[PDB]
């Protein structure tokens, strides 16, 4: 659990980006100014929701350690949504927005992932929420977010493909 003196400076930099007056805390106003500069236009209310999720001491503002938490939570969530999406892309050959049992079977076999056709058929059956025989994005996401589970092995194979697809391409 070390800590590079640089990595610290970076969190300091992210923090100062929000704390304009530099008193050590992040007020809603401050969060908003930044938020707008990036895109969204959250309401005095929507902003408060962000604070609460990290407000450890519940004093209304965001201190460095709390921001640190928020920072991480989002770094993880953002990184995740990206590799899952990237993976979806790698599977949805035709790009029509679905993943036919063919697309799935082929990719997994072409990567030397070694998965019995049954396991692949099972994978689909389980992810197929609406039962249309294919996997849409929502259903793919769910599958990568959810006992006698060897489905965990499959998820790790897929997370790697996603991560790889990003890192490279």
Q: Quick one: which of 7, 33, 52, 96 contacts Ca ion (CB under 5 A)?
A: 96
Contacts of 149 (CB under 8 A, 6+ apart): none
Is 28 marked as binding a ligand?
no
Among 8, 17, 56, 146, binds its own copies (CB under 8 A): 17
Distance of closest approach, residue 57 Cβ to Ca ion, in angstroms = 4
Q: How far is CA 81 from CA 69, 75, 101, 147, 162, in A?
A: 18, 10, 23, 25, 10
CB neighbours (10 Å) of residue 139?
Answer: 19
Is 66 annotated to bind a ligand? Reply is: yes
13 binds its own copies (CB under 8 A): yes
Burial (CB count within 10 angstroms: exposed 0-12, middle 13-18, buried 19+), residue 125: exposed
Could you say whether residue 9 binds its own copies (CB under 8 A)? yes
* Residue 83 or 92 with smaller CB distance to Ca ion: 92
Instruction: Please tell me whether residue 151 binds its own copies under the rule CB under 8 A.
Output: no
Residue 21 binds to Ca ion (criterion: CB under 5 A): yes
Distance separating alpha carbons of residues 63 and 131, to the nearest angstrom: 47
Residues within the annotated binding site for Ca(2+)?
A: 19, 21, 23, 25, 30, 55, 57, 59, 61, 66, 92, 94, 96, 98, 103, 128, 130, 132, 134, 139
């Amino acid at each position: 659990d070390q800590l590079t003196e640089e990595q610290i400076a970076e969190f300091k930099e992210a923090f100062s980006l929000f704390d304009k007056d530099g008193d050590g805390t992040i007020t809603t106003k401050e969060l908003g100014t930044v938020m707008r500069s990036l895109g969204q236009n959250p309401t005095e209310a929507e902003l408060q929701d962000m604070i609460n999720e990290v407000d450890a001491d519940g004093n209304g503002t965001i201190d460095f350690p709390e921001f640190l938490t928020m920072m991480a939570r989002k770094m993880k969530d953002t990184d995740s949504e990206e590799e899952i999406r990237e993976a979806f892309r790698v599977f949805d050959k035709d790009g029509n927005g679905y993943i036919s049992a063919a697309e799935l079977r082929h990719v997994m076999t072409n990567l030397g992932e070694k998965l019995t056709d049954e396991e692949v058929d099972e994978m689909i059956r389980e992810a197929d929420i609406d039962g249309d025989g294919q996997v849409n994005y929502e259903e793919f996401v769910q599958m990568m977010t959810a006992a006698a589970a060897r489905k965990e092995v499959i998820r790790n194979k897929i997370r790697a493909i996603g991560k790889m697809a990003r890192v490279f391409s």
